[model samples]
Target chain A: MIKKEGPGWRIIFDSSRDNFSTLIGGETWAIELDKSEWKILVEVVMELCDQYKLVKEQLMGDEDITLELERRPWLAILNGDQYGWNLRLILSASGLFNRGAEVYWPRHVTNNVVNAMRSM
Target chain B: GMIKKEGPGWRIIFDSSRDNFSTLIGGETWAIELDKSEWKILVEVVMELCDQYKLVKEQLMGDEDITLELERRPWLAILNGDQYGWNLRLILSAFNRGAEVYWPRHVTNNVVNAMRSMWD
Candidate 1:
């Protein structure tokens, strides 16, 4: 079990190779966003993952990992353009993404969230 | 003045106290598009002076003669998020004004132009 610190959330992954252990780890990962904005991010990630699988089967006629990645570069582009890239850059340079950066989003869950971003 | 074959652009400084000299440098800073197919590289090189000013100010602030150096320049300077002396504070105020004028539009134009230019 992972403990939260102040406004931050933590996700602990157990990498034991046992099938049962992997299932337990997946369960833990699923529940990691029980309380926070991360819940929304988790939902988006899961939806994108499903879309990736669907696109792979439809476009490539197989579930090959390499082909899936090759066909759906937009998934990574969307995620990085929306969230992770700027967050990582800010963490490296300024320690925090300025409050003004957060002002780009009115509410976290809307479809227009990505369009509202300065980077996107 | 006759143009020297130094490559691309010239720096025009009107201040007589400074060297007021022009030096040519290379790099395409602008472009023109013909229809949706043919494009021409305008080869306009932009020299951003403020970045150099910021670097020099940071270096001077780090030196041992900070007080004398600051007295001579008396500009508002920021190290990380912290504001320095009264002169620095006044300078920071001026910086804020400059930011209000340039920061948003500059970031928007530069980012969009850079991304579009990259594809070309």
Candidate 2:
């Protein structure tokens, strides 16, 4: 990826980090990862969000929001750490993003999420 | 609610004979009865907590983005299950389907464990 910050990357990192900080409290711990680690963090954050939309939209209301949340290994990662920065980031970001009709997820990710959602 | 006790004595009991979903945390018995239709809801919520920990040294709680605050300011939430024929979102129905949790600043040793078990 380019070292330069893109509009999309700014939204992802800012949303994730800020929302994350809200739940865990501001900066309980800092994950000072190198460039690739930051990339992994953002990618997973975006996909987890995309999955939230897929499951939320597709669910017939049985489990609804709860189940979309339950089995995600990525969330389990957030739940893994107390005051998890990445976890809070996703949820808080989702809350903000959900306020308007936002183009939050990329098309390919949504396609994959849609496919997996149907498979489940 | 004969609320008392603490530690690993947390367990859930779904006794069809009694038609109630009950929990025993450190010997305090808290329960809610279900009409077969709501049984699935009970199972779904209970299933999420394969393991739960105290949010703080003395309490546990969460509501979207404030999980980290529980350590500094403990809050206990119960399902907002009481609106069978009402539109109020502020009450808990021990007899029907909702719970209203509160943060009682005065934490007792008794409620300590029960509150922690409530975290998911």
Candidate 3:
């Protein structure tokens, strides 16, 4: 675990690469925050994740729902580090209902989070 | 309803409800379709948007042609299965270029036709 402090958050970076062992079998890369950055990062991720979930739920209503990030990595930085945390999710697509749905973080948002961290 | 065969060309879609009324005036969702030549212009628009939004950070990590870096941004597709729908689609090439300028498939096609119509 790599630990660092940012403006409103103290990020604890998990270096584990196995998705199955992490949250929901999704390769998890995370930042542990104190207050401000944590709230913002949570809001951003939740908003993005909510929109995605809505789309998927609408597109595939009432199915065995599993959400996975596709094509893009999750980015969050700790303190003023030049390098950020990146986690790529791995999912199983051989199930019924929807398969192969994924999402990625935009470079803009990644930068935004990093910049926000630095400002803090 | 509009109908057209799918091909290799570009398309645009209109959504008056979501148009940026404040900036572009009239606030109508107008789409432009582009063929080979027009596609080039569309690519320029994408490049411009990327620049305006500071969307390309990796490229800035090193000096490179904006256009070339814009093209390489397609790699976001490789990381799609890593997240949710919102970020996944936006970063992916499927939604990066002209597709970003419009929403909904039909509207996208319309934009493509409009751009193509201009050249014709």
Candidate 4:
């Protein structure tokens, strides 16, 4: 298990279980992720950090823009079209199998969450 | 613990560690976490208010807001309807720690539907 954390959020990548878990603020959960999804997550995080300016501008023009990191079971969505600059990025990971878990990234903590994931 | 249900970007899951469940709401820049029980009750209250919102939706009722406070916990639910009833905002909060999620009616309905269709 590889763990990366910043402030009130943490991400754990469990290769054994093929599980990627995130604990953001008070919500936490582990979700099953195939290798592809892990790659998708890494790529998405890279995009957020590397092209922050472009992405922000893109979202500003559209209110409902969504970047889906993965499909069902553990659906991850990224959006940055909130009203304030601090509310610029939002990530929600929801499990859709039986009774799973859902976790979110806090405001001003999007960079923190993104930075943590960069190492893994 | 597994995933119970999922929607566009949100999910509900059971967490064995707490022997309960969790609900997460997020957007482009932030996230808010809630306990499943409180989340469910709050969602219920919001739904009930939404029913009332629809009833008075067609009237020129001026902007109105309805809120519900859960006595057992620090959670609060608020639903606001615009003067023309064309817009609705739902806010869920855990005031003790100042954690909250704000969603427009369309997204709120999608999330509420996922919460309602739990796997027994």
Task: For candidate 4, give the lDDT.
Answer: 0.47
Model 2 misplacement above 4 A: A1-29, A60-120, B1-120
What is each predicted model's overall lDDT from 0 to 1?
0.21, 0.27, 0.29, 0.47
Second chain TM-score, each model: 0.17, 0.26, 0.24, 0.58
Give model 4's docking category.
Answer: incorrect
Docking quality band of candidate 2, CAPRI definitions: incorrect
lDDT of 3 by residue, B14-98 (tens): 2234212101100012222222333344444444443333444343433333321233343221111111111111222222111
lDDT measured at residue A69 in model 4 versus the true structure, 0 to 100: 44
TM-score (chain A only) of candidate 3: 0.26
The TM-score leader among the candidates is 4
| Docking model 3 quality class | incorrect
- lDDT string for model 1 (A75-97, tens) is 12122222121110000001111
Better of 1 and 4 by lDDT: 4
DockQ-wise, the better of 3 and 4 is 4
If both were scored by lDDT, which would come out higher, candidate 1 or candidate 3?
3
TM-score of each predicted structure versus truth: 0.19, 0.21, 0.20, 0.40
Residue B92 in model 2: lDDT: 24
Error of model 4, residue B88, in angstroms: 6.2
Given candidate 4, what's the lDDT at residue A15? 53
